[PDB]
Paper text:
Fifteen fragments were identified to bind to the RRM1 nucleobase pocket, all interacting with key residues in the two ribonucleoprotein consensus sequences (RNPs). Interestingly, all fragments identified on the RRM1 nucleobase pocket formed van der Waals interactions with the conserved F17, F57, and/or F59 and frequently π-stacking with F17 through aromatic rings or similar heterocycles. Earlier studies by Vitali et al. showed that in the [name] apo structure, F17 and F59 have correlated alternative conformations, with side chains adopting (i) F17A–F59A orientation (RNA-bound conformation), seen also in the [name]-DNA and -RNA bound structures and the only conformation seen in other RRM–nucleic acid complex structures and (ii) F17B–F59B (anti–RNA-bound conformation), not frequently seen in other RRM structures, including the RRM2 of [name]. Fragments binding to the RRM1 nucleobase pocket modulate these dynamic features by recognizing different RRM1 RNP conformations. Three fragments (Z1373445602, [name], and Z106579662) sit on the RRM1 β-sheet in an orientation that closely resemble that of the purine ring of the central A2, with their aromatic rings sandwiched between F17 and H101, stabilizing the F17 side chain in an RNA-bound conformation but not altering F59 dynamics. The authors also highlighted that these local dynamics are influenced by the conformation of neighbor residues and the binding of RNA is essential to stabilize one uniform set of conformations. This is consistent with what we have observed in our structures, where the binding of fragments on the RRM1 nucleobase pocket directly locked F17 and F59 in different sets of conformations.
The human heterogeneous nuclear ribonucleoprotein (hnRNP) A1 is a prototypical RNA-binding protein essential for regulating a wide range of post-transcriptional events in cells. [name] ability to carry out these wide range of functions is encoded in its modular domain organization consisting of an N-terminal unwinding protein 1 ([name]) domain and a C-terminal intrinsically disordered glycine-rich domain. [name] is composed of two RNA recognition motifs (RRM1 and RRM2), which, despite having a high level of sequence similarity and recognizing similar optimal motifs (5′-YAG-3′, where Y is a pyrimidine), are nonredundant and functionally nonequivalent. Using the XChem facility at Diamond Light Source, we carried out a large fragment screening on [name] protein crystals.
Numbering used by the authors: 7 to 91, 101 to 182
Amino acid sequence: PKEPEQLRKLFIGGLSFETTDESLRSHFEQWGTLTDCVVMRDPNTKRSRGFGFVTYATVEEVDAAMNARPHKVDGRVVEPKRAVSHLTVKKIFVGGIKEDTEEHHLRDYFEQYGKIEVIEIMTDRGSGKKRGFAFVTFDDHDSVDKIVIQKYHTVNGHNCEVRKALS
Ligand SMILES: c1cnc(N2CC[C@@]3(CCOC3)C2)cn1
């Protein structure tokens, strides 16, 4: 059972124009088996477009590569991101938590996706009653990107709806 290829891909932005298929592969093979690795180039000049893609054999290998950031590739710090499902944010909306879900429920669950900086459990402006949704802010976008591709999120026995949240 192979994970869908789309979930095993990293877009790599900010490449040095001297990075090649081969040097990008040599770099990112340190964190897993690469089934594909390409530098995007102009069709006429062959000059690099400054970005590429790598595809790992498993999602755990994608995780390993993201956890090894920052990546300096051929002398330049590059910008890896998981393929789109890019709206790059650090904050999620968590809905369906009802009125019994507390901060530690959200923290104990979401801390395994990334480092949490803010948890905001929403309350009614007039009564102070919990409204049944929350916002979690992380220190980095990959946490959110991992979270929103999951089909399900179970927190405090609730099946939650989780979406990217923007400013
Ligand atoms: C994260 C960030 N960017 C991504 N894009 C994919 C290729 C792109 C669209 C067409 O040309 C450039 C940019 C994907 N995932």
